[PDB]
Structure 1
Amino acid sequence: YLMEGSYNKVFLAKGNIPAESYTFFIDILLDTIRDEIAGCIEKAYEKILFTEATRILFFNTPKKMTDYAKKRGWVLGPNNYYSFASQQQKPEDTTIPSTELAKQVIEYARQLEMIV
C-alpha cells in the first residue's frame, strides 16, 4: 500500500496492529510519510485553507503546521497556501543537444568509414 499512492488504507493498518506493539516501526513509518506529504504538498495545488491540508496528515491545529509551512513554501497567509507553480526556467535548450549530439555524430562517422 506504500507502493501506490494509497495513504489512508496505510493508516487503517495503523488502526490494525494485531500481533505485538510494532511501535518504533510505525513511528518511523510516520516520519517517512510526514516528509512524503510535505514533499507531495508541493504538487500543482490551488489555495488550500488551514483545515483541508491541515487534516491530511493527522493534526487538528497545532504549531506543527508552521513547522511544515516554514520548512517548505505554501506561505502562511490569510488562510491560504500560496502556489509557486512556475516550472518555467529549464526549457529552450539547444546547447545541451548541441554539445551531446556533436559528440554522437562523430561517433557515427567512426564506425562508418575507418576500418575497425
Structure 2
Amino acid sequence: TIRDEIAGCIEKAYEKILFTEATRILFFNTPKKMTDYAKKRGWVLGPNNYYSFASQQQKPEDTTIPSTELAKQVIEYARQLEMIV
C-alpha cells in the first residue's frame, strides 16, 4: 500500500526524475519491477528518466453542465418562490 502510494503520487509534478532515486524510493535496484512500473504505469523508460506526459481539461463544452445545473438550480429557486400550494 506504499508501493501503489508512490505509483499514485508519481503522476504529479515529478516532471522528470532520474531513475536511481526512483530505485531508492520505490524499491528493487535493477528489477523487473521497473518494467512493472514503467509499463503497467506510464512514465516512459527513456534515457535515465521517467518522462512526464501532459493532459488537459480545457473546460470547453461546459459552459453547459454549468448551464443545465443552473437550469436545475434556478428552476429550483423559481419553484420555491413559485409555491403557492
CA contact (8 A) 1:74 1:82 kept: yes
User: Partners in 2 of 1:55 and 1:96 — Cα distance?
Assistant: 45
Compute the displacement of 1:66 (Å): 1.0
Alpha-carbon spacing, 1:92–1:70, altered in 2? closer, same or farther (3 Å): same
Given the two structures, how large is their TM-score scaled by the length of structure 1? 0.64
Render the CA deviation track for 1:29-73: whole Å, top value 9, x for unaligned: xxx211111111111112212201121122222121111110111
2:16 is the counterpart of 1:47: yes
Structure having the larger proportion of residues in strand: 2
Alignment coverage as a number of residue pairs: 85
Cα contact 1:47–1:82 (8 A) shared by 2: yes
Q: For structure 1, which segment, 100-109 or 82-91, has the greater mean C-alpha deviation from structure 2 after superposition?
A: 82-91
Q: Percent identity?
A: 100
Unaligned runs of 5+ in 1: 1-31
Show structure 1 runs of 4+ deviating over 2 A.
85-92
2:72, 2:53 → 1: CA distance?
A: 37
Q: TM-score, normalised on structure 2? A: 0.84
Counterpart CA distance in 1 for 2:15 and 2:80 is 53
Structure 2, unmatched stretches of 5+, are none
Q: CA deviation at 1:114?
A: 2.8
The Cα shift of 1:90 comes to 4.5
CA–CA separation in structure 2 for the residues paired with 1:90 and 1:50: 34
The alignment's C-alpha RMSD in Å is 1.8
